Amino acid sequence: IWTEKIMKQTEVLLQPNPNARIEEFVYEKLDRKAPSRINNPELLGQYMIDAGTEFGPGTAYGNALIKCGETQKRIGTADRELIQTSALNFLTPLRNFIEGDYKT
Amino acid sequence: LAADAGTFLSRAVQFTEEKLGQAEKTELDAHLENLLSKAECTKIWTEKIMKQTEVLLQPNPNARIEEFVYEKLDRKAPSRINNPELLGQYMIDAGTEFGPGTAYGNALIKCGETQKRIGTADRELIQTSALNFLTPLRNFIEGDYKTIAKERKLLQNKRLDLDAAKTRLKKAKAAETRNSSEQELRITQSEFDRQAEITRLLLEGISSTHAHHLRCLNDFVEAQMTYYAQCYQYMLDLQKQL
Amino acid sequence: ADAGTFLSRAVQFTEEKLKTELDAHLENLLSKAECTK
Amino acid sequence: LAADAGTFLSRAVQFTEEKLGQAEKTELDAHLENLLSKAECTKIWTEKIMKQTEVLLQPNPNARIEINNPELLGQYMIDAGTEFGPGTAYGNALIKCGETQKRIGTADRELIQTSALNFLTPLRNFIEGDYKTIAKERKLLQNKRLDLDAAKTRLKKAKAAETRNSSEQELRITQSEFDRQAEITRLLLEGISSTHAHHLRCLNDFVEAQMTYYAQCYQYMLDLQKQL
């Protein structure tokens, strides 16, 4: 009981958006790869960078916008890395146990 | 009062003929054209960043929809515990059930605490950012932009009148009527010029807007720094105990 | 025109919604197993 | 599963392009086209004739959905005759006329049974069988044609030679199924020829039924005249 609760909530913590999970479930049943959606940080970075470019790269405001966009994209990548590691060395074993030994 | 309807009629017919391409448009001064264009672009991007920021802060869209409903319903949206703190609660309860003496119990309970601390830190960032960033910008978009929009319409209307008068003079034959039209043309031109200055004056204020926003961005940054810094320290502490 | 671009976007989404072929022997076996189940 | 949805998407998109006229439409062979048209016409006309025949035999719509008018009139006449006095000449005539009116009603019921089972039934059977079966195959033939045209569109849009070669194979697959379905529908269309000959024999039966009805009714009226 406890193992199941923790395994689920921690997955929620990793993927906050419910619609995304629903899409994953559908694509899992569809047996087809779900599109590689861009995460919030990178998208925000893109918006900031493009906006800064439009206002003028030389301008201090533009410079800041571009810099922040770059950092934001870096953060997004790091986040993706974190998500991959957790599901590979944490969620996996627990799921294994609940799905195999428990049946026996 | 009926004369006003005639003015609305005149502005319309002219707008149609100009759209018909039969009539041309008196181009505005390049400076004002430039000023208006800059103000617009600014608003467009500022709006986009504000929205994407919000999404970043509150990932759950359904929650945002519920807030909108209660906002329109003029009711309070029930508060909810964030994912980090919730996980902590489940973990702590588990640890307790498995037995505090057991190392597994010790670890689970210890972690649940760190998670709740982290959740608290998260809410701090959300409030700090909202207070220091989103609002300042929102203000600008809701107030100054609106005013400028109104003035833009006034000048646009005046131009319509001017163009209509021109067209009327173009098709003026009777000397006396043509002279009256000349007086009418002078009349509209003056009013058009007056509004143009009014508009340019207001547009001048946009220059400071960029500087004001820059400060807000610097603040947001400081907030993120604060959030991660706290969380990092919290994590370190947890590993030491475990 | 604009309709064509909208159709292109629709097709892209269809692609969003929707391979090393294994040796025949294995494939045939896989099909057999599935049919049996 | 997902395959079902995918197939539908391809067919509809190609069809819309052809409807818009931007995309060309692969046509069918004249022989198959002629056969399909003949079958459609047969069902349309046969349907109308059978329905009107029902109205003619049973004018009452409610009765058609389900005592006949002649027999009801006969009842009224006989009752009146008794009240007016059976011995009275007026009473005598009313009673005799009512009886004959009921006999005519009986013959009408026989005609309805005889005709419907020898004329309406066969016409209905053809529409329920030959036409429907053809329509099902005709629909699948249109689906196969859409698949073929979609393959041709994919082929023309397959700039890559290897992709075009794959589209050629796909086109061949669609063509084979398309041609197969055409032949299946064609066989059903050939059956319509026999349907016409069968229908002709049924028409003759309906004619015979009407003649018997009129002949019997005439004799009944003759007898009443003599008695009165």
Residue numbers in the entry:
A (entry chain F): 54 to 157
B (entry chain E): 11 to 252
C (entry chain H): 13 to 30, 35 to 53
D (entry chain D): 11 to 76, 91 to 252
What does the paper say about this structure?
BAR protein endophilin B1 plays a key role in multiple cellular processes critical for oncogenesis, including autophagy and apoptosis. Endophilins are a highly conserved group of N-BAR proteins that contain an N-terminal amphipathic helix (H0) and a 20-residue amphipathic insert in helix 1 (H1i). BAR proteins are typically dimers in solution, where the dimer consists of three α-helices from each monomer that form a 6-helix bundle with a characteristic crescent shape.
Our EM structure of the endophilin B1 lipoprotein complex consists of six endophilin B1 dimers bound in two distinct conformations to a single artificial lipid platform. The final volume consisted of six endophilin B1 dimers and had a nominal resolution of 3.88 Å. The volume contains a membrane bilayer density with anchored amphipathic helices. Dimers bound to the surface of the bilayer and dimers that straddle the edges of the bicelle have distinct amphipathic helix conformations. The local resolution of the BAR domains is higher than that of the inserted amphipathic helices, suggesting the protein is flexible at the protein-lipid interface. Interestingly, no density corresponding to the SH3 domain-linker region is visible in any of our maps, either near the concave surface or proximal to the lateral part of the BAR domain.
